[PDB]
Amino acid sequence: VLEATMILIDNSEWMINGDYIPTRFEAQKDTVHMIFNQKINDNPENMCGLMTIGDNSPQVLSTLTRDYGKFLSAMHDLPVRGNAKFGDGIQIAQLALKHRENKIQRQRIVAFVGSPIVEDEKNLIRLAKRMKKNNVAIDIIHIGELSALQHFIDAANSSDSCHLVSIPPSPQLLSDLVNQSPIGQGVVA
């Protein structure tokens, strides 16, 4: 698939928990690299960008790129604290995706949620149906305290393009578990 993907990380205070090894935040950070590489390896022209949804206010950390070093440099020193703003994040991500240079690229969001969603369900469904209308696919990696997101994904989904990957606390590594999910890398040949 030829697509531009905005990867949204949760850097809220909820992510300072050691119930995922070594913390939720750091668990997520390793998973981002895997998702990145999946996209970059899918098509030579695929690009990824990086946003936060926590610390009170979603931020674009990296515009669309194939250089993972830009993600790592932008995350260095990043605050992990404050509230998550899920709906604001997926709206800002859609605005960012409009600025993609290569507009032949399909549009996708991959978002991590490790915190309570601030939107209520009626709001979540409006968000989802608006994405679907906008031809924006979305995958959500849900961790921590684990239904509303299943309804969201069902409302956004078109042609089996959207996924909810829900991973409880465990001894195993989040990146490995997500790699073993529908949105993981798979194999080559």
As a three-state string, the secondary structure of the chain is CCEEEEEEECCCHHHCCCCCCCCHHHHHHHHHHHHHHHHHHHCCCCEEEEEECCCCCCCEEEEEECCHHHHHHHHCCCCCCCCCCHHHHHHHHHHHHHCCCCCCCEEEEEEEECCCCCCCHHHHHHHHHHHHHCCEEEEEEEECCCCHHHHHHHHHCCCCCCEEEEECCCCCCHHHHHHCCCCCCCCCC
Assigned domain for 185 exists: no
In whole angstroms, what separates CA 78 from the centre of its chain?
A: 17
Q: Could you give the number of structural domains in the chain?
A: 1
Assigned domain for 29 exists: yes
Assigned domain for 72 exists: yes
Which of these, 14, 30, 177, 150, lies nearest to 83 by C-alpha position? 14
Query: What is the rounded (10 degree) CA torsion for 11, 13, 18, 23?
Result: 10
Assigned domain for 189 exists: no
CATH number at residue 73: 3.40.50.410
Range of the domain at 100: 2-180
Alpha-carbon gap, residue 71 to 7, rounded angstroms: 10
Instruction: Supply φ then ψ for residue 100, to 5 degrees.
Output: -60, 135
Structure tokens that stand for 75 in this block? 């995350």
The coordinates were experimentally obtained by X-ray
Q: Determine whether 161 is exposed, middle or buried from the number of CB atoms within 10 Å of its CB (0-12, 13-18, 19+).
A: middle
Which of these, 106, 99, 134, lies nearest to 46 by C-alpha position? 106
Residue whose token pair is 């001894």: 171
Assigned domain for 186 exists: no
Assigned domain for 188 exists: no
Assigned domain for 187 exists: no
Assigned domain for 19 exists: yes
Residue type, 15: M
Residue type, 101: E
* Interacting residues of 14 by C-beta distance below 8 A, sequence separation 6+: 24, 54, 84, 114, 115, 116, 144
Resolution, rounded to a tenth of an Å? 1.3
Residue type, 92: I
Task: Please state, as a whole number, how many other Cβ atoms lie within 10 Å of the Cβ of residue 75.
Answer: 18
Alpha-carbon gap, residue 97 to 56, rounded angstroms: 21
